[PDB]
Amino acid sequence: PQITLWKRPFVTIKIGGQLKEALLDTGADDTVLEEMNLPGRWKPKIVGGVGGLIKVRQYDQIPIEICGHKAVSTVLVGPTPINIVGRNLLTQIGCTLNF
Amino acid sequence: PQITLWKRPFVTIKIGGQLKEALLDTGADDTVLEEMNLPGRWKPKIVGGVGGLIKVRQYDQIPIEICGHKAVSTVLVGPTPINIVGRNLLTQIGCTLNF
Numbered sequence A, B: 001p002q003i004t005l006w007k008r009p010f011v012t013i014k015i016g017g018q019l020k021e022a023l024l025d026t027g028a029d030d031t032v033l034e035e036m037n038l039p040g041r042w043k044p045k046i047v048g049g050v051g052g053l054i055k056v057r058q059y060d061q062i063p064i065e066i067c068g069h070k071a072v073s074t075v076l077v078g079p080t081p082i083n084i085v086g087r088n089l090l091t092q093i094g095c096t097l098n099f
């Protein structure tokens, strides 16, 4: 289907056995989530946004259910003020912009 | 047009006769541009993202042209590291997410 943009485009994602709300964000290179536990190895990374830099944990090959897709992706975890779904995950599920 | 998300979705915009590259960003509530001069009244605003807050100037009713679509909308100006087109302008040009 389609999603208009009069409202913030939140979708529900299933990740780590939890249901979370996340913003579909074409301006984000990567998917960044608020503090949570995920299993497996991680490596520290710096993420920079409009207000400055934050430290995050990078988890690879995390399964995520999103918009009827069973996806697998890299996920960054840290002090973001909102869960964002970035182009890494948007491309995997075939999302595009159209006007 | 249609725009995939394997690369950052930059488009050329025209504002006040000036050509600029901006990111099409569904996570951004409102268009934010790097420091520039615009005419008319403004009011300060605070916007927040990854890494914290910034102060911007809000100009209302500014003409902006994007891929042949003309709009008159609110434009924020401040220390963003890149030009961002937000949902306020995406909606006015009929842009949607599709998958």
Ligand SMILES: CC(C)CN(C[C@@H](O)[C@H](Cc1ccccc1)NC(=O)O[C@H]1CO[C@H]2OCC[C@H]21)S(=O)(=O)c1ccc(N)cc1
Residues within 6 Å of the ligand: A023, A025, A026, A027, A028, A029, A030, A031, A032, A047, A048, A049, A050, A051, A082, A084, A086, B025, B027, B028, B029, B030, B031, B032, B047, B048, B049, B050, B081, B082, B084, B086
């Ligand atoms: C955090 C979002 C809810 C809001 N942001 C839009 C978002 O697309 C920014 C837009 C953005 C893009 C580049 C640089 C700064 C901000 N991208 C972002 O922070 O992504 C980071 C995660 O992936 C990495 O790839 C880009 C930076 C990292 S935002 O820049 O703070 C913002 C907030 C409000 C408005 N009106 C305009 C923009």
